[PDB]
């Protein structure tokens, strides 16, 4: 009895990368040649299945790999170096972007430290960039930790919304 990957791959609305969804599926056969030929993906790297997924813009899809570095890998979704699973991603400009821009998709932009593998942070505390404290109030060197992806239909593929699914074991 094969796995119901359509449950997460074809979900109505995905989650922001910083608040990534962790849907887990157990005791089903996870075949790969079947998931490949289902739809032409843009990324299909491989290295009780946890199928966690989220939306990131295209030029940051490369950060969903073992031992990467950058906004996404550091502060949003960190994979360990010994990752044993698959990273599946594909374009979704028509679904996740609207004329004038879809802003529902967010990402963490600063953090006092890096994420451990598979850690998820969804705090809303004012990031202190300077020696002066913020005291909850936002200003110079006092930035809100979450920002919004643009996602206009005119953006280049680098700044275009991409659906990402990671099969972990």
């Amino acid at each position, epitope marked *: 009895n094969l796995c119901p990957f359509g449950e997460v791959f074809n979900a109505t609305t995905f989650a922001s990368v910083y608040a990534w969804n962790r849907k887990r599926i157990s005791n089903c056969v996870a075949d790969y040649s079947v998931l490949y030929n289902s739809t032409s993906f843009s990324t299909f790297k491989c290295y009780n299945v946890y199928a966690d997924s989220f939306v990131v813009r295209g030029d940051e899809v490369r950060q969903i790999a073992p031992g990467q570095t950058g906004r996404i890998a550091d502060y949003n979704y960190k994979l360990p170096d010994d990752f044993t699973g698959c990273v599946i991603a594909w374009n979704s400009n028509n679904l996740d972007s609207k004329v004038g821009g879809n802003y529902n998709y967010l990402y963490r932009l600063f953090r*006092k430290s890096n994420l451990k593998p598979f850690e998820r942070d969804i705090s809303t505390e004012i990031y*202190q*960039a*300077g*020696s*002066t*404290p913020c005291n909850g109030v936002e*200003g*110079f*060197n006092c930035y809100f930790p979450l920002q919004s992806y643009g996602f206009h239909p005119t953006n280049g593929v680098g700044y275009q919304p991409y659906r990402v699914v990671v099969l972990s074991f």
Partner: single-chain antibody
Amino acid sequence: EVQLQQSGPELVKPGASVKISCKTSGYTFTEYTMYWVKQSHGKSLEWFGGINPNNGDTSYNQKFKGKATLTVDKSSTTAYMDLRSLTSEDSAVYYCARDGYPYYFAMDYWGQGTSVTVSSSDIVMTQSQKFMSTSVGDRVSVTCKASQNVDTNVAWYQQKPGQSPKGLIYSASHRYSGVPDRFTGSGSGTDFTLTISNVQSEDLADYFCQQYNTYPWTFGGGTKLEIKA
């Protein structure tokens, strides 16, 4: 390794406009906030304004509203202060300084200063003793009183004859890297004291305190130390 190298001196006519530079190296430019300090002859330090090189955000002390513009060039790892419409009041030494947070609070590295001379409810820090004299080996204390609560967010700086300020104490009572055990910091809230334990020959300098609790940052008036032997 870390090094803030500034432009040369510039003499200009009044009502002119000049852009000085602060070329950084030895560290990742986008990591730390850059600041600028004005200091007139024999007068104290005035926090001029800051800039975040990672995104361009700035903050100006309203005392010097619209008299300068802070910018950064990430390709050349250089910070710029463009002074505009120069009057005789503007002639002074201008220091660029680096915010050492998240490691060493306040301004842990200072440029060498560019001497610009033209020719043709805030926080207040109180340093009662302008001058003060001791001898080698004596103990001595310097005091600061703030108009408001500033918690422990205060730094202590040392300016030796004709030299850029060097950080001594950050966060009320923590020494910077390579500061003798003789300098000990003390205080909390409203009253802060800096104690120089075994006064040395080197210690002949002018000591300022500086609050980094709220912008615009403010300095003390300078307490001059003088040694005889």
